[PDB]
Amino acid sequence: AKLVCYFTNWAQYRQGEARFLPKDLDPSLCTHLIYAFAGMTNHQLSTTEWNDETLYQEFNGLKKMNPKLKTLLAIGGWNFGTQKFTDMVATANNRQTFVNSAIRFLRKYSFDGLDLDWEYPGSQGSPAVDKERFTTLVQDLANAFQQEAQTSGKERLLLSAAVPAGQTYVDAGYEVDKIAQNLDFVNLMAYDFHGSWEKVTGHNSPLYKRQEESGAAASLNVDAAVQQWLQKGTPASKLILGMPTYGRSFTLASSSDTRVGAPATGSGTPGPFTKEGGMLAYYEVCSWKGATKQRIQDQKVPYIFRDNQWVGFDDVESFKTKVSYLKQKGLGGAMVWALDLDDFAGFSCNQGRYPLIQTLRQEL
Numbered sequence: 001a002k003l004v005c006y007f008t009n010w011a012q013y014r015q016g017e018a019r020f021l022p023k024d025l026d027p028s029l030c031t032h033l034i035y036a037f038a039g040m041t042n043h044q045l046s047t048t049e050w051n052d053e054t055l056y057q058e059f060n061g062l063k064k065m066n067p068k069l070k071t072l073l074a075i076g077g078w079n080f081g082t083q084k085f086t087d088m089v090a091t092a093n094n095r096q097t098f099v100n101s102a103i104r105f106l107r108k109y110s111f112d113g114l115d116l117d118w119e120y121p122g123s124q125g126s127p128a129v130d131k132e133r134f135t136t137l138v139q140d141l142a143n144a145f146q147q148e149a150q151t152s153g154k155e156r157l158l159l160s161a162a163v164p165a166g167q168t169y170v171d172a173g174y175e176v177d178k179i180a181q182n183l184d185f186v187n188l189m190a191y192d193f194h195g196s197w198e199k200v201t202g203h204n205s206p207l208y209k210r211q212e213e214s215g216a217a218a219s220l221n222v223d224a225a226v227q228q229w230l231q232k233g234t235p236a237s238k239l240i241l242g243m244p245t246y247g248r249s250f251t252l253a254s255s256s257d258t259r260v261g262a263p264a265t266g267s268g269t270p271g272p273f274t275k276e277g278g279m280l281a282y283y284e285v286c287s288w289k290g291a292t293k294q295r296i297q298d299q300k301v302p303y304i305f306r307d308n309q310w311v312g313f314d315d316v317e318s319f320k321t322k323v324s325y326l327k328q329k330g331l332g333g334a335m336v337w338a339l340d341l342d343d344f345a346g347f348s349c350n351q352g353r354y355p356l357i358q359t360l361r362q363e364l
């Protein structure tokens with residue numbers, strides 16, 4: 001099995017003990033480490049932080065202690081947007097420029113592969129033509145990686161993609177059957193099913209539906225997303241089940257309705273370290289004082305509330321339940337967003353280093 005873990009190159013700016021650098025990585029924790037994110041300049045792979053070259057060296061240097069470990073570089077992400085992807089896939093010349101630059105870039109810095117994190121072809125302003133052009137891009141990369149292995153005699157560069165769970169995004173952007181053939185693995189973003197964009201509380205990453213849910217709302221859960229990607233032609237061994245080490249938070253309309261589905265007026269208060277309303281790191285929720293934690297029986301995941309703040313998150317138990325699920329489905333492994341949102345240095349939860357991700361490592 002695979003345990004695929006995302007590193008983020010802006011976690012180095014978190015305050016206090018939440019600051020995360022490559023030295024905070026455990027080289028044995030995961031099987032695959034993915035560096036988020038690279039960017040793009042004139043259709044060519046580029047860095048996004050002043051110290052990326054140094055961090056790349058430290059990141060890929062972890063393989064000196066664990067030669068089984070594989071690293072990948074992720075291009076894209078939310079802030080990157082879509083326009084630069086759209087322009088690069090628009091012509092065969094531009095794709096060739098990108099593909100050649102990716103090979104040189106990954107080999108220069110000692111990455112083992114590329115993870116595609118376009119959010120998303122066919123959506124967020126990307127035109128409908130980008131669905132098939134994404135398929136062509138994946139084919140172009142896969143073909144060029146295969147050819148480069150014959151000329152360098154190194155292990156063939158890996159190609160993965162982070163892919164959405166929501167059927168709207170999947171059908172707008174993803175020829176699942178065609179891209180899954182050319183991807184080494186598929187990192188399913190099985191989270192963000194609910195959040196403070198909604199008018200009622202709901203869980204970030206429930207495993208199953210609640211009974212009150214029917215129709216398209218019965219698809220806003222991990223099981224539905226997994227079934228969709230399997231049905232549409234992803235081999236189970238290539239489907240990697242994403243799990244969140246963060247939760248999504250709400251401000252309740254009234255402290256007098258605290259249920260799942262209770263009215264909410266917007267995002268929860270930003271966390272002291274992550275400072276983004278509507279999400280909290282596991283280490284910001286695990287040690288809430290004076291709160292009430294409960295499990296959503298149907299959905300196999302917890303929520304916690306205190307006063308008018310309500311958070312759906314994942315804990316050790318829900319991670320255990322989801323690994324049991326992925327093994328029953330014969331999936332290829334688990335993926336985690338993100339290393340720096342677990343209690344990576346045991347500073348908050350009194351559970352040791354990486355309590356959530358170490359749970360995955362033990363159960364896989």
Ligand SMILES: Cc1cccn2c(=O)c3cc(C(=O)NCc4cccnc4)c(N)[n+](C[C@H]4CCCO4)c3nc12
Pocket residue numbers: 077078079117119162189337
């Ligand atoms: C507004 C929004 C609308 C629709 C989709 N959206 C995202 O799909 C999304 C993703 C991310 C993200 O980081 N993906 C990284 C990642 C990479 C690989 C694996 N797993 C995770 C993101 N930061 N935002 C914006 C923050 C700020 C406010 C809400 O959420 C996102 N917003 C949106």
Ligand SMILES: Cc1cccn2c(=O)c3cc(C(=O)NCc4cccnc4)c(N)[n+](C[C@H]4CCCO4)c3nc12
Pocket residue numbers: 166168169191192193195196197198
């Ligand atoms: C996955 C996801 C990840 C991170 C953030 N996300 C959103 O911030 C989001 C917002 C909305 C939304 O309605 N924003 C309007 C609105 C904005 C502000 C207040 N109130 C309302 C949304 N629909 N999705 C799911 C997509 C998926 C397909 C159909 O829509 C969203 N997903 C995500």
